[PDB]
């Protein structure tokens, strides 16, 4: 009787696919995909409101106490623990100008900024609060040189010679 | 005082994270004209739940604020609820809608 009319369509589709696959040889820039390979990257990718509430509480504590370097350090830690480091660097630069003569805030601002900015931050912290052993140690640690660290150690010995 | 109900004591640690745990549910309410004060003491966990935003605490405080007026007699209830917290006054005014007889007026003076 009436045979499977879909057989002709299947044969035509197979012929078209074979012709396309053969023509694919001439495609020099032919490229493929790896969903199965990506599957390993998706399985390896496995690691909100409370973090936003903590960030809002840190912002309210910084607005209620601008001269609190524990509040500025907590705001910098909350901004650097999640999201981007630019907001943490801006908060550290705001806390260094709002609460001067603080060793912990200057240490957090030196740890949050890059070294080209950390050198200027350590220079500003030495100009605002000199004879600091932690600021001098952070400046000698962010020098990446022998002569620069020797000059920083000589400046720390000339400023505060009673530091072990 | 809306902040008193939402006030959370924060721990201090050099390396450990600060424990900004809630203190209590009392709003430090006062009424000098009434010759007394109101202490709406609530559990700290009840005052501020886990991952509870400030807006969520304000919404829950409004329900408790209306509850205190509901428990009190209409005559004994404050005829004018003068709260300096203008932002929190509107939910209190919205809560005050449950009591049409009572009125809510902004408090320029802050206790």
């Amino acid at each position: 009787g009436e045979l499977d009319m879909r057989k002709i369509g299947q044969a035509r589709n197979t012929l078209m696919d074979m012709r396309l696959s053969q023509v694919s040889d001439s495609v020099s820039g032919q490229t493929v995909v790896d969903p199965k390979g990506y599957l390993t990257d998706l399985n390896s990718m496995i690691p909100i409101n409370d973090i936003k509430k903590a960030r809002l509480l840190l912002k309210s504590v910084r607005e209620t106490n601008p001269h609190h370097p524990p509040a500025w350090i907590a705001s910098a830690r909350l901004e650097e623990v999640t999201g981007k480091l630019q907001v943490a660097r801006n908060l550290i630069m705001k806390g260094t100008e709002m609460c001067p003569k603080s060793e912990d805030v200057w240490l957090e601002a030196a740890r949050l900024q890059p070294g080209d900015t950390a050198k200027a931050v350590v220079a500003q912290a030495v100009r605002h609060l000199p004879q600091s052993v932690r600021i001098y140690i952070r400046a000698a640690e962010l020098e990446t040189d022998i002569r620069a660290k020797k000059r920083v150690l000589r400046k720390a010995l000339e400023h505060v010679p009673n530091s072990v | 005082d809306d902040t008193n109900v939402y006030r959370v004591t924060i721990h201090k640690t050099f390396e450990g994270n600060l424990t900004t745990k809630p203190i209590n549910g009392a709003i430090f309410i006062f009424n000098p004209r009434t010759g007394q004060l109101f202490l709406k003491i609530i559990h700290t966990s009840v005052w501020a739940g886990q991952k509870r935003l400030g807006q969520l605490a304000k919404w829950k405080t409004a329900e408790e604020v209306a509850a205190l007026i509901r428990s009190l007699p209409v005559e004994e209830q404050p005829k004018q609820i003068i709260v300096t917290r203008k932002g929190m006054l509107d939910p209190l005014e919205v809560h005050l809608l449950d009591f049409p007889n009572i009125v809510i007026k902004g408090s320029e003076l802050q206790l």
Binding site: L57, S60, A74 | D2, Y6, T9, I10, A57
Partner: peptide, 29 residues
């Protein structure tokens, strides 16, 4: 983060979000 319960100020919803530049500067990143 002092031991005072009020040490951390209450976080009231604000900084109204909006395609409006409050700072009034045309951003160019």
């Amino acid at each position: 983060i002092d031991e005072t319960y009020g040490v951390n100020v209450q976080f009231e919803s604000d900084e109204e979000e909006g395609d409006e530049d409050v700072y009034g500067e045309v951003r160019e990143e």
